[PDB]
Design an enzyme around this catalytic site. Structure first.
Site, PDB file in Angstrom:
ATOM      1  N   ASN A 195       0.947  -1.132  -0.009  1.00  0.00           N
ATOM      2  CA  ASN A 195       0.118   0.032   0.018  1.00  0.00           C
ATOM      3  C   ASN A 195       0.930   1.054  -0.003  1.00  0.00           C
ATOM      4  OD1 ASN A 195      -2.073   1.949   0.224  1.00  0.00           O
ATOM      5  ND2 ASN A 195      -2.426   1.499   2.434  1.00  0.00           N
ATOM      6  N   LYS A 222       0.017   4.276  -0.078  1.00  0.00           N
ATOM      7  CA  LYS A 222      -0.688   5.426   0.433  1.00  0.00           C
ATOM      8  C   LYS A 222      -0.516   6.684  -0.213  1.00  0.00           C
ATOM      9  CE  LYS A 222      -0.365   3.229   5.228  1.00  0.00           C
ATOM     10  NZ  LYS A 222      -0.187   3.426   6.817  1.00  0.00           N
ATOM     11  N   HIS A 261      -9.563   0.449   5.051  1.00  0.00           N
ATOM     12  CA  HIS A 261      -8.512   0.838   5.640  1.00  0.00           C
ATOM     13  C   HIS A 261      -8.488   1.677   6.626  1.00  0.00           C
ATOM     14  CE1 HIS A 261      -4.234   1.991   6.252  1.00  0.00           C
ATOM     15  NE2 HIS A 261      -3.936   1.188   5.663  1.00  0.00           N
ATOM     16  N   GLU A 285      -6.781   4.189   8.017  1.00  0.00           N
ATOM     17  CA  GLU A 285      -6.917   5.437   7.612  1.00  0.00           C
ATOM     18  C   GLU A 285      -8.201   5.917   7.307  1.00  0.00           C
ATOM     19  OE1 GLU A 285      -3.604   5.446   5.586  1.00  0.00           O
ATOM     20  OE2 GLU A 285      -2.313   5.003   7.123  1.00  0.00           O
ATOM     21  N   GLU A 340      -5.010  -5.010  10.804  1.00  0.00           N
ATOM     22  CA  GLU A 340      -4.300  -3.803  11.403  1.00  0.00           C
ATOM     23  C   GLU A 340      -4.431  -3.687  12.721  1.00  0.00           C
ATOM     24  OE1 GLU A 340      -4.478  -0.221   8.430  1.00  0.00           O
ATOM     25  OE2 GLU A 340      -6.362  -0.898   8.126  1.00  0.00           O
ATOM     26  N   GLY A 384       1.652   4.006  16.417  1.00  0.00           N
ATOM     27  CA  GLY A 384       1.998   5.119  17.294  1.00  0.00           C
ATOM     28  C   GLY A 384       2.532   4.817  18.418  1.00  0.00           C
ATOM     29  N   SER A 444       3.284  -3.007  11.152  1.00  0.00           N
ATOM     30  CA  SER A 444       4.559  -2.321  10.732  1.00  0.00           C
ATOM     31  C   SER A 444       5.173  -3.249  10.149  1.00  0.00           C
ATOM     32  CB  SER A 444       5.487  -1.484  11.846  1.00  0.00           C
ATOM     33  OG  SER A 444       6.298  -0.663  11.105  1.00  0.00           O
TER      34      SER A 444
END
Ligand SMILES: [F-]
Lengths: 249, 243
Positions: B8, B10, B92, B94, B164, B170, B206
């Site tokens: 991806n 992005k 996704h 996001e 995910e 973060g 990640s």
């Protein structure tokens, strides 16, 4: 004199074949030479349109996001548009404000970033039916414009075109008269004169983004503060050529 | 289940950077046993599909719910079909969390993309706050149930589930395996034992060159949805994890 400006918003419409037929018609058309024309295809067809379309018509994206790059799956940036030779973007379209919940501040952030990244912006504003019947037409457009004014410079406005969308006359079955559209455009221009500057009010094209077709475009274009159109469905049709030519006899 | 690696990109790419990334991929030696899909920004889909080796398929990062209509800024699955783009990433994190896409909207998009002949990388996963409230199982169940209510048992053969761990954004392999197992149990109890056995569940945390093989070893991890590393030559090292 403000250059007449005709934008065609294809929205979520187009195929390779239908776009080729649409572009061939525009390439073969006799167009008013003093009209600035911009076409906004879906994002996946922007290279196709930019490569096939006559160079005097410029291409627009229908939306972009607020940064140059990053972790924003499904978003495109103004840097990408510049990379591909796309000089325009539509921002704040009522469909994006309503269906996708885009805030006044988000539209203002997007506008500032597109301007700083070298694009011109068709900035869309307009009030719903409830806002209009509650008497808040001017409070709504002043608020929507103030958010941009607060983020962009006076010189930034030179690459902005304001599209007034009478959301109250879109999907409600109501029809806006040229008189009603003229009244809001004049109110928009006075807002610019009193909240930005004399220059910005005199120079900024305010185009009408209500229902525009071959049957009404000439009467609309004659209104003193209507500087052109943001056309929806008719921009998919051959009569888009007539709309571009609305100021011709 | 055939190993599946998705890249991806992005909101990243230019003509010049994509040209180097694609030529690196075209020069790479790839594990023939792996199914590879890459997802550029929408404006670069034609450029990538033309230049990229045909054994890597191209995906869009999003699409909408209908064939066409008055949805400024949106792209249709029919447009993707028209352009020879056979995959799309839907749901996704996001899109769900920044841009507010609901579980029902993601389901509508999934059913429309599948009905239009596309395959779907369906993204699910819980936030830090949700995991802290003990809602991991409840969240993946509700996200999946929205799709399962709308699509048939056979529709699932063109779906790849990407989990995910938004909560980690973060992130251990045992923590990933634990959720993949729960997702597969959900499929078995709510769809069928066969869909559960057949559906690829790929890990979308990640991912980089260091964790590939350890994650690929987990019994219920069937590949990866790769973020930032998919812009790098190391994406090739990730494709070849089972080797
Ligand atoms: F990702």
């Amino acid at each position: 004199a403000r250059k007449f400006f005709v934008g065609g918003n294809w929205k979520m419409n187009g195929s390779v074949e239908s776009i080729k037929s649409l572009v061939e018609t525009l390439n073969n058309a006799e167009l008013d030479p003093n009209v600035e024309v911009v076409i906004a295809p879906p994002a996946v067809y922007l290279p196709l349109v930019r490569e096939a379309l006559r160079k005097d018509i410029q291409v627009a994206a229908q939306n972009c996001y607020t940064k140059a790059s990053g972790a924003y799956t499904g978003e495109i940036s103004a840097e990408m548009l510049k990379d591909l030779g796309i000089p325009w973007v539509i921002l704040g379209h009522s469909e994006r404000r309503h269906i996708f919940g885009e805030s006044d501040e988000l539209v203002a952030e997007k506008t500032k970033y597109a301007l700083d990244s070298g694009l011109s912006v068709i900035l869309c504003i307009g009030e719903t039916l409830e806002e209009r019947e509650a008497g808040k037409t001017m409070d709504v457009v002043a608020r929507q414009l103030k958010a941009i004014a607060d983020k962009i410079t006076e010189n930034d406005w030179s690459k902005v075109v304001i599209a007034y969308e009478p959301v109250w006359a879109i999907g409600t079955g109501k029809v806006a008269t040229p008189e009603q559209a003229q009244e809001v455009h004049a109110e928009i221009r006075k807002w610019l004169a009193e909240n930005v500057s004399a220059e910005v009010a005199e120079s900024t094209r305010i185009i009408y983004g209500g229902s525009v077709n071959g049957g009404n475009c000439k009467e609309l274009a004659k209104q003193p503060d209507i500087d052109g159109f943001l056309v929806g469905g008719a921009s998919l049709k051959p009569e888009f050529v007539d709309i571009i030519n609305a100021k011709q006899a």
